[PDB]
Amino acid sequence: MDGTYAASWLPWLLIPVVTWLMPAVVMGLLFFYIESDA
Amino acid sequence: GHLSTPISDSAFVRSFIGNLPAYRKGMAPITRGLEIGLAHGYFLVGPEIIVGALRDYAPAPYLGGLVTAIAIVLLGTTGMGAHGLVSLKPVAESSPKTDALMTSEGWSEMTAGFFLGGMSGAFMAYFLLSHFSEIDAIFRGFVN
Amino acid sequence: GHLSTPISDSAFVRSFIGNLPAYRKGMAPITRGLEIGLAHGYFLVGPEIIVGALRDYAPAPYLGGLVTAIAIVLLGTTGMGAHGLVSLKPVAESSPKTDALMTSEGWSEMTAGFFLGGMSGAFMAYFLLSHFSEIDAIFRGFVN
Amino acid sequence: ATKFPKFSQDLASDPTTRRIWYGIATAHDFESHDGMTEENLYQKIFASHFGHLAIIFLWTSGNLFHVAWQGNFQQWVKDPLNISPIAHAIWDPQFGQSAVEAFSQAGANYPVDIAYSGVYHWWYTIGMRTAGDLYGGALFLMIMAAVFLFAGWLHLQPRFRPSLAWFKNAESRMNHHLAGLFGVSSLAWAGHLIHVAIPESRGQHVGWDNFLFTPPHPAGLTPFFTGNWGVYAQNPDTASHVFGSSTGAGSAILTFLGGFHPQTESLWLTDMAHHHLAIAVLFIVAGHMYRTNFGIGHNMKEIMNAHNPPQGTPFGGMIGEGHKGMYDTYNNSLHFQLGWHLACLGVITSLVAQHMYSLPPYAFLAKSYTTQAALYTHHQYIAGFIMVGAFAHGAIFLIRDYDPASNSNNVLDRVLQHKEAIISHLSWVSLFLGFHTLGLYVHNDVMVAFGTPEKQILVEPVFAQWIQAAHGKLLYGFDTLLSNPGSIASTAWPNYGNVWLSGWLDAINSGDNSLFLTIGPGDFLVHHAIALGLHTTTLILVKGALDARGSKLMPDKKDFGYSFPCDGPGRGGTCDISAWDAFYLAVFWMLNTIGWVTFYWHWKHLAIWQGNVAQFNESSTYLMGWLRDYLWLNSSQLINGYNPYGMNNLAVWAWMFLLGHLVWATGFMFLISWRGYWQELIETLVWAHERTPLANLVRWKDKPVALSIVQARLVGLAHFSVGYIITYAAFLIASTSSRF
Amino acid sequence: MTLSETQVFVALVIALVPAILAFRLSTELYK
Amino acid sequence: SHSVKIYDTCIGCTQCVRACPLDVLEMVPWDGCKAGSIASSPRTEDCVGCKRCETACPTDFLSIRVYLGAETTRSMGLAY
Amino acid sequence: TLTGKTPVFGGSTGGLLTRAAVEEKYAITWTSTKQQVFEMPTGGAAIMHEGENLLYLARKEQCLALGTQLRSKFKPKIEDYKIYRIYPNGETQYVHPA
Numbered sequence A: 001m002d003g004t005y006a007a008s009w010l011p012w013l014l015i016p017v018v019t020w021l022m023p024a025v026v027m028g029l030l031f032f033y034i035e036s037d038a
Numbered sequence B, C: 001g002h003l004s005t006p007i008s009d010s011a012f013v014r015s016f017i018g019n020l021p022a023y024r025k026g027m028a029p030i031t032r033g034l035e036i037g038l039a040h041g042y043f044l045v046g047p048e049i050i051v052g053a054l055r056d057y058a059p060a061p062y063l064g065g066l067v068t069a070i071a072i073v074l075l076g077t078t079g080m081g082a083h084g085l086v087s088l089k090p091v092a093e094s095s096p097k098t099d100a101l102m103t104s105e106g107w108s109e110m111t112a113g114f115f116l117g118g119m120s121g122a123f124m125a126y127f128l129l130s131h132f133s134e135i136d137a138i139f140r141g142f143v144n
Numbered sequence D: 001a002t003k004f005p006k007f008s009q010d011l012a013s014d015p016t017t018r019r020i021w022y023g024i025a026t027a028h029d030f031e032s033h034d035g036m037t038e039e040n041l042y043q044k045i046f047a048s049h050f051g052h053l054a055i056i057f058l059w060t061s062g063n064l065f066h067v068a069w070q071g072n073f074q075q076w077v078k079d080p081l082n083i084s085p086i087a088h089a090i091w092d093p094q095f096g097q098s099a100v101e102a103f104s105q106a107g108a109n110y111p112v113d114i115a116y117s118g119v120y121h122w123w124y125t126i127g128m129r130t131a132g133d134l135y136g137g138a139l140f141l142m143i144m145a146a147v148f149l150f151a152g153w154l155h156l157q158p159r160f161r162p163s164l165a166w167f168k169n170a171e172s173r174m175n176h177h178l179a180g181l182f183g184v185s186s187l188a189w190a191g192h193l194i195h196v197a198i199p200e201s202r203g204q205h206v207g208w209d210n211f212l213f214t215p216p217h218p219a220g221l222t223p224f225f226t227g228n229w230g231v232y233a234q235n236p237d238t239a240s241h242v243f244g245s246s247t248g249a250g251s252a253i254l255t256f257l258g259g260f261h262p263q264t265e266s267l268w269l270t271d272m273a274h275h276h277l278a279i280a281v282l283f284i285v286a287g288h289m290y291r292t293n294f295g296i297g298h299n300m301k302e303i304m305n306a307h308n309p310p311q312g313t314p315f316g317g318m319i320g321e322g323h324k325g326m327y328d329t330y331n332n333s334l335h336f337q338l339g340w341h342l343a344c345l346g347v348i349t350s351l352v353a354q355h356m357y358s359l360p361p362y363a364f365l366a367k368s369y370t371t372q373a374a375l376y377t378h379h380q381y382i383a384g385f386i387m388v389g390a391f392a393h394g395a396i397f398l399i400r401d402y403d404p405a406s407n408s409n410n411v412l413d414r415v416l417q418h419k420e421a422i423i424s425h426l427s428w429v430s431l432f433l434g435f436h437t438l439g440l441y442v443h444n445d446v447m448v449a450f451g452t453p454e455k456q457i458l459v460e461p462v463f464a465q466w467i468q469a470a471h472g473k474l475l476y477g478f479d480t481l482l483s484n485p486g487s488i489a490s491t492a493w494p495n496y497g498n499v500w501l502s503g504w505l506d507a508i509n510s511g512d513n514s515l516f517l518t519i520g521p522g523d524f525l526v527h528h529a530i531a532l533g534l535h536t537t538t539l540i541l542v543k544g545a546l547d548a549r550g551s552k553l554m555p556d557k558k559d560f561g562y563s564f565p566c567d568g569p570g571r572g573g574t575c576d577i578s579a580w581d582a583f584y585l586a587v588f589w590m591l592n593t594i595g596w597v598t599f600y601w602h603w604k605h606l607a608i609w610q611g612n613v614a615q616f617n618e619s620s621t622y623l624m625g626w627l628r629d630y631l632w633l634n635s636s637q638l639i640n641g642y643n644p645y646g647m648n649n650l651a652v653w654a655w656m657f658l659l660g661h662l663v664w665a666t667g668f669m670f671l672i673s674w675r676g677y678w679q680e681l682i683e684t685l686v687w688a689h690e691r692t693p694l695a696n697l698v699r700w701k702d703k704p705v706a707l708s709i710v711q712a713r714l715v716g717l718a719h720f721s722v723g724y725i726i727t728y729a730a731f732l733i734a735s736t737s738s739r740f
Numbered sequence E: 001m002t003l004s005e006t007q008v009f010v011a012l013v014i015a016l017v018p019a020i021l022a023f024r025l026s027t028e029l030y031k
Numbered sequence F: 001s002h003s004v005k006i007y008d009t010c011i012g013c014t015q016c017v018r019a020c021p022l023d024v025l026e027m028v029p030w031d032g033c034k035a036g037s038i039a040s041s042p043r044t045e046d047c048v049g050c051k052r053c054e055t056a057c058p059t060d061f062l063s064i065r066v067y068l069g070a071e072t073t074r075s076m077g078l079a080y
Numbered sequence G: 001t002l003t004g005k006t007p008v009f010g011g012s013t014g015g016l017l018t019r020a021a022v023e024e025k026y027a028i029t030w031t032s033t034k035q036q037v038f039e040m041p042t043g044g045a046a047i048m049h050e051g052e053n054l055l056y057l058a059r060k061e062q063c064l065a066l067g068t069q070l071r072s073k074f075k076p077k078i079e080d081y082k083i084y085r086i087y088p089n090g091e092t093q094y095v096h097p098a
């Protein structure tokens, strides 16, 4: 995986952020929202 | 009620399971989580070492098993921690004599223990496999 | 009394700050300190990596950021620990329902958590930067 | 009770996992929520529409940004016939190194996807030429989306919250949307084509720097006021014009040519400018029809009340009376409006598909075969989903909003009274078409299999061939109007204003475009299969809507709602009796219908593009030819996207092809196996967790239950539909882009 | 030619203002 | 819970009360039919929604109707 | 608060779960003239005693299905069964026959 487009280091960071960190954070926050009592 | 079986009426099974660190009487919750974490992070390095993507990668044949076990211990810690936050009540809002893993501070003590044991058990297994040629010289006496 | 502002009457601000690990209800103090420590030791490696004295030192370009973050976490732990020793009273010499961070054992539990999270968050950031060429091959698929 | 869902106290007290599922599924049914007043309903819908608009503008902005950042738009405009467009770059760390080289295509040295949406052909025709052009377009849609996001937040603030009467003022909404949203936007688009797109089509760079100083015409607006507008219809772009340069370029800005530009095989840009100016005038004046507080105009209510007989036929009479109270039937019911606005949008979405392939509006779109295949199938499947949802919300209106007291013996009351005549007549047309279309196919199959392909029944479609001859096609030799050179319609006798006619007959007799293709006996049978699919899907949807309030099996069906499982095994058994269940059955028939539509479009075009139109003409009359010469034959390069000898760029479509077969088949589990099997299975799993040491320390918050009867019909239909779409989309793109 | 590294970074900064405004509309539609 | 409604067309044949596996229904003296009894539904919070009562009702249309409402642990038939 | 003999039964996997301890419970008492064999509503054969019997079950439907078996499957019939709803605090509410 490499790119010659401008700032090709951005998919290096953003694809782990969008597909690992963001879903784990959103599923974590949605777990708190749908399982909180009262 | 329940069944009377030669597994349920087995005294070795009840003494083994009852003295696993989840159940062993008199343990603090931080120590329960620590012993559970050290066992679990240690074996979790192994699978990606032998059959993973970095098994034929000469610069770092062991890095894939370490970061796999770290991220599994991360999601295991966060899932265990989020579980106690939604399921349990603190020690103030419970009765006395309330079985500390059934309180939220005791469960989160166990969660902190699982993280610390899990990552460091994973780093321990990674460290021995990374230094395996020097462990092998120790175990064979090539260091004299 | 205080001001009624659109920051103070903001429900997202109060839910974010109130659920940071210093304030999040039901956490044990060891777990509060651990989460705070892991976040703080991790970023503290970074500055000496990029603009420090060992940034152009080929034998160890990352060692300067690690020992900087370790010594800051040491003085942060010792200052936090000495703070609780002079400021707070133990759980015996306090009333019931006494907000465990306001007791000396709860503050020192948080201090022990900050040390363990802080050094290991620092070692985690050091370990990824030291293995960055192998992390980059993982993240680009040069390991296939 | 729990927090989620906030809007339903009946669901928030549910102790099982059904609460989570139903809270997701009823979140946008705003009328069912607790304490929903009518104008809090309209205000939440209004702000929701601001959010949906901003999602569209961010979606377009991301299309422009990724083409500008990672595409090859500048290299593509130099040679749009052999450069493939780039959608975006690939970042997949799980790729092996021979997959990086297989996807490093379209003249790029990084892995890319070949775009098939047609955004290159669209942005090139409307005047964009550089990545800096698309980048400023991308930044502009991002601030526009931020404007609409702020506008939705602002119109929920208590001061700016609109009243209920502002939401029901239909005359002011139609005047502002005909004149402003339709007319001024079409007028401003004619302004873009004349000032920007037509100069950029003639080698002239026009941007924000110098568009105040380059006139669109050399005689600029001095002949517009004097009324001699024919000087704007000059020498057009000639038959030797090269698109994007001043070679062969005319100077006219508003022509009336017809047909296609001979290089691009696309519509003339000066016809599309004169189209958008002409309908802007028809829409701006139509926005000055209904009365507002300026004093005259029309009340929509009094027009419909006076249109009862009407009549110049009479026909007094039998129908109906009708049209009394249909203003407030329309205006009080949001489900009547949504069902009506989807039925109009569904006809228009399918009109987009049938016209963009035969009258291509974009330069070199008619030679990008995979893009043309993808665009037709996209807009026909979307039109099929929109059309079924028009009937779904028509049935929700009949349960929730329909008033038989107000609508008393009007047109809408009257269709329900002879509802057994409409359903039984739809049932006969469906049975007549299906018995005879399938019977003709099976008869031809037996003739070809027995070795006698001249005994098969080949009915020529003589009515639609006559329409092609009536529009100017000379291949069948009928010689009626517009193919008769001396007919009344071709000469256009008293005015002779037939300027389009020479361009039209040039394009309709060229045997190289998709404009009124030659049709034969294979085209006869598949139109009657399509008519079968249109009538059966209507039959399920109409009978679901007309029996939604009750039938003889369940007379009080409106008391139970739009969606409910059944009424129990009594009275013979009542599985799938609700009106939601007839939505559910009709999605199957819709997908089968659009399946037969897009199979036929693709095979006829793939036969034309391969230079063998006789393969369609010989094999489409029996069903083994469809299986062998269309499905089996064109699967070859797709399923070799990876094999034991390696992989190529079709490996993502091969993998998606198998994924689509898997999702489709997973849906069969939810559709065939039903609930009580799974609830008793989950009961043993609940037992095993509670009795397992070290795992019974972990307790669920919600009790695990099987999915409900309605939910797994929906989940099974969703897997069926998703597996239907991505299987064909993988096959359509890989069978067309492998040889083209 | 494609974008420069400054043009990509400007778009990421410009993307923050629909990101903040969608968050404001999200919490306003919820209540 | 579910809603069980008994209508004025009940003939007091008590077959819906015999058919109920959860003992939701009982007969109340009514004098509005020849039998003098009508079905009633006091314990609707124990109703599972099986509609065995509607299967047993011999009037056309049914004198007893079950409306499936908000789900509880009792109405979902859960032993856990 | 309720007397009666537990039926002779080796136990099974179909009986009470965590709900019986924390939410609600059910008991059915009946008096029998014979030491006979009946089918459990949770599966399996048990031995009822002469005199008062007492059986704890998870749901009300399981108790009423046993009472239907006590009526229709024995000679003579057993009508005198009583069903009680037991709460975790110990409050025992007599629910059938109401």
Ligand code: CLA
Residues within 6 Å of the ligand: A010, A011, A012, A014, A015, A018, D054, D055, D058, D059, D060, D061, D062, D063, D065, D066, D088, D089, D090, D091, E011, E012, E015
């Ligand atoms: C909204 C349409 C849209 C779509 C479908 C995509 C899709 C993609 N982007 Mg792109 N992105 C977009 C808009 C979009 N982008 C815009 C407008 C910008 C300029 C700020 C970017 C800037 C950008 C960068 C710098 C990169 C990507 C990348 C990618 C790819 C990997 C996912 C990712 O890491 O995104 C990252 C996402 C962002 C940086 C922010 C996205 C901002 C959009 C507008 C948010 C859209 C939210 C949406 C409307 C919510 C809809 C509702 C939801 C329920 C569906 C993926 C093909 C990566 C790539 O190209 O790999 C090869 C990558 O490195 N995008």
Ligand code: CLA
Residues within 6 Å of the ligand: D024, D025, D026, D027, D028, D029, D030, D338, D342, D385, D386, D387, D388, D389, D390, D392, D393, D396, D562, D563, D580, D583, D718, D722
């Ligand atoms: C402008 C268009 C429009 C609008 C505003 C609405 C609005 C509405 N519809 Mg309607 N409808 C529409 C078009 C529209 N619809 C179309 C096109 C169809 C045909 C499909 C329907 C058929 C329909 C039915 C049968 C029903 C509604 C209902 C509703 C209401 C509630 C929706 C809800 O809360 O569920 C939220 C929706 C979901 C939770 C479903 C999301 C999942 C779906 C199945 C897509 C899954 C795709 C998947 C994510 C893709 C990933 C693939 C990948 C993994 C490989 C709401 C008023 C309901 C109603 O009014 O009840 C009385 C109702 O029963 N609609």
Ligand code: CLA
Residues within 6 Å of the ligand: D056, D057, D060, D117, D118, D119, D121, D122, D184, D185, D188, D345, D348, D349, D352, D356, D362, D375, D379, D382
């Ligand atoms: C799920 C829904 C869906 C999706 C994802 C698509 C996707 C697509 N459509 Mg399709 N379409 C759909 C449903 C959909 N369609 C429906 C329901 C209709 C019937 C209305 C159409 C009718 C249609 C047509 C006629 C065309 C497309 C085209 C396209 C393609 C181009 C991308 C695009 O549209 O940019 C996003 C576009 C916009 C955001 C347009 C904004 C401009 C609006 C109309 C006017 C703006 C006026 C301005 C603000 C006023 C200023 C006035 C002032 C100056 C005075 C893309 C493949 C085009 C194509 O085939 O390209 C090859 C094309 O020509 N679509």
Ligand code: CLA
Residues within 6 Å of the ligand: D427, D430, D431, D432, D433, D434, D435, D438, D532, D536, D539, D540, D585, D586, D588, D589
């Ligand atoms: C290929 C599979 C298939 C076939 C052939 C059919 C056929 C039919 N569907 Mg069905 N449907 C299907 C799949 C299919 N469906 C699926 C998967 C669903 C989703 C569950 C539906 C949901 C559905 C609905 C909701 C409705 C239909 C209706 C119909 C009938 C439409 C009227 C017609 O065209 O008459 C032509 C008849 C045929 C094409 C079938 C006859 C086949 C030949 C001629 C039989 C020859 C006799 C044979 C040799 C003797 C047997 C030999 C020996 C064992 C005795 C037709 C019988 C509609 C209906 O019944 O309205 C009247 C209707 O409302 N279907």
Ligand SMILES: CC1=C(/C=C/C(C)=C/C=C/C(C)=C/C=C/C=C(C)/C=C/C=C(C)/C=C/C2=C(C)CCCC2(C)C)C(C)(C)CCC1
Residues within 6 Å of the ligand: A027, A028, A030, A031, A034, B036, B040, B076, B077, B079, B080, B082, B083, B114, D024, D698
């Ligand atoms: C003890 C222990 C343990 C355990 C732990 C646990 C306890 C865990 C948990 C876990 C968890 C606790 C998890 C969670 C998860 C979650 C999830 C997975 C989520 C998801 C979500 C979603 C998916 C969402 C959805 C949605 C909604 C809701 C709304 C709308 C939107 C959407 C659709 C998105 C371990 C193993 C470590 C080890 C040893 C020790």
Ligand SMILES: CC1=C(/C=C/C(C)=C/C=C/C(C)=C/C=C/C=C(C)/C=C/C=C(C)/C=C/C2=C(C)CCCC2(C)C)C(C)(C)CCC1
Residues within 6 Å of the ligand: C036, C040, C076, C077, C079, C080, C082, C083, C114
């Ligand atoms: C929570 C936390 C924290 C905090 C901590 C703290 C709390 C700290 C403290 C600190 C401290 C607590 C410090 C201390 C210091 C001290 C000092 C600095 C001292 C000095 C001294 C001197 C200088 C002396 C003087 C003198 C005298 C007195 C006498 C005579 C002689 C002489 C002059 C020498 C941190 C940040 C970590 C992080 C996060 C968490």
Ligand SMILES: CC1=C(/C=C/C(C)=C/C=C/C(C)=C/C=C/C=C(C)/C=C/C=C(C)/C=C/C2=C(C)CCCC2(C)C)C(C)(C)CCC1
Residues within 6 Å of the ligand: D051, D052, D054, D055, D058, E008, E009, E010, E012, E013, E015, E016, E018, E019, E022, E023, E025, E026
């Ligand atoms: C500062 C700075 C920067 C930046 C950074 C960042 C921070 C960025 C990123 C950015 C981003 C990361 C962005 C994001 C975006 C996002 C968006 C824009 C979103 C949207 C969304 C939406 C639109 C939503 C929708 C919705 C839903 C889904 C549901 C509910 C409703 C609503 C509609 C709301 C740079 C380095 C360049 C340069 C230097 C400085």
Ligand SMILES: CC1=C(/C=C/C(C)=C/C=C/C(C)=C/C=C/C=C(C)/C=C/C=C(C)/C=C/C2=C(C)CCCC2(C)C)C(C)(C)CCC1
Residues within 6 Å of the ligand: D336, D339, D340, D343, D344, D347, D390, D391, D393, D394, D395, D397, D398, D542, D545
């Ligand atoms: C060819 C041609 C022509 C003709 C045209 C025509 C005449 C057309 C028409 C058209 C048509 C003829 C269309 C139609 C459509 C329809 C539809 C699409 C329907 C739908 C429906 C719906 C969906 C409904 C629903 C509902 C219900 C069911 C119930 C109640 C409610 C509602 C009403 C909503 C002309 C002369 C121009 C010339 C050129 C050529």
Ligand code: SF4
Residues within 6 Å of the ligand: F006, F009, F010, F011, F012, F013, F014, F015, F016, F017, F038, F039, F053, F056, F057, F058, F059, F063, F064
């Ligand atoms: S409701 Fe039906 S079954 Fe019950 S008593 Fe009345 S008629 Fe008989």
Ligand code: SF4
Residues within 6 Å of the ligand: F004, F019, F020, F021, F022, F023, F024, F025, F046, F047, F048, F049, F050, F051, F052, F053, F054, F066
């Ligand atoms: S639905 Fe079932 S449980 Fe409810 S009253 Fe009828 S028979 Fe009894």
Ligand SMILES: [Ca+2]
Residues within 6 Å of the ligand: B052, B053, B054, B055, B056, B057, C143, C144
């Ligand atoms: Ca490898």
Ligand SMILES: [Ca+2]
Residues within 6 Å of the ligand: C052, C053, C054, C055, C056, C057
């Ligand atoms: Ca140095």
